[PDB]
């Protein structure tokens, strides 16, 4: 086509989606990670995670308002990944990298799994 | 913070949101523009438009499944702007620029209004 493109559009959309999440606006699901609960938008979770994409395209699970993750999932690792979904920024630290990588593998977030593998390899 | 950032994350999210729109997955509103109907995600519309942001934060309108736009709104201009919301690409042509600018002013999409004003000024 002969379209023009606004460079900052995708980033501006994601920024506003994070503002709606922070104010709990039109969030339609709560993700339960052991004792912790995280409110989010199903569409953003599906857009970021192969696991959520599979869950919310399922004809019965698409209608659930609560999703319980596997008890081995670390709430902090999930929190870091949810923040990444809504911002493009990943808070990867020596103290959380193992939990972040395991959570990213479970959530099927291949680019996160990749940078965790590389950061771990450099420390070996 | 000491976060790392994935450059293509926002663009990848928007691409997946457009894929969900194309397959009519988790769309929660229909925008009526005279004889034409457009299915979308309320969160994406709010993230792109000052008008939709105001509509869907309203305590009664947030729950509506159908929104009727002003009868002066051109369906093609709306279609072009909805495509822009979900892709960052604007199909701006001599034959549609007036309708696109008027629709962008109504929808409160200031960056689109700006490029339309500039493209019109160059042709004068």
């Amino acid at each position: 086509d002969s379209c023009i493109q606004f460079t900052r559009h995708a980033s501006d959309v994601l920024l506003n989606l994070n503002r709606l999440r922070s104010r709990d606006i039109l969030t339609d699901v709560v993700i339960v990670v052991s004792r912790e609960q995280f409110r989010a938008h199903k569409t953003v979770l599906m857009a970021c995670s192969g696991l959520f994409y599979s869950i919310f395209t399922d004809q019965l699970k698409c209608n659930l308002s609560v999703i319980n993750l596997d008890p081995e999932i670390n709430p902090e690792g999930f929190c870091i990944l949810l923040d990444f979904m809504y911002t493009s920024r990943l808070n990867l630290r020596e103290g959380n990298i193992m939990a972040v990588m395991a959570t990213a593998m479970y959530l099927q977030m291949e680019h996160v799994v990749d940078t965790c593998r590389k950061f771990i390899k450099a420390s070996e | 913070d000491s976060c790392i950032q994935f450059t293509r994350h926002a663009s990848d999210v928007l691409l997946n949101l457009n894929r969900l729109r194309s397959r009519d997955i988790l769309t929660d509103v229909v925008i009526v523009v005279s004889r034409e109907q457009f299915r979308a995600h309320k969160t994406v519309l709010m993230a792109c438009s000052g008008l939709f942001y105001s509509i869907f934060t309203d305590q009664l309108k947030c729950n509506l499944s159908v929104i009727n736009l002003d009868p002066e709104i051109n369906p093609e201009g709306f279609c072009i702007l909805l495509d822009f919301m979900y892709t960052s690409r604007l199909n701006l042509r001599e034959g549609n620029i007036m309708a696109v600018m008027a629709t962008a002013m109504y929808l409160q999409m200031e960056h689109v209004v700006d490029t339309c004003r500039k493209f019109i000024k160059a042709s004068e």
Partner: peptide
């Protein structure tokens, strides 16, 4: 705005 750019030519993509």
């Amino acid at each position: 705005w750019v030519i993509p």
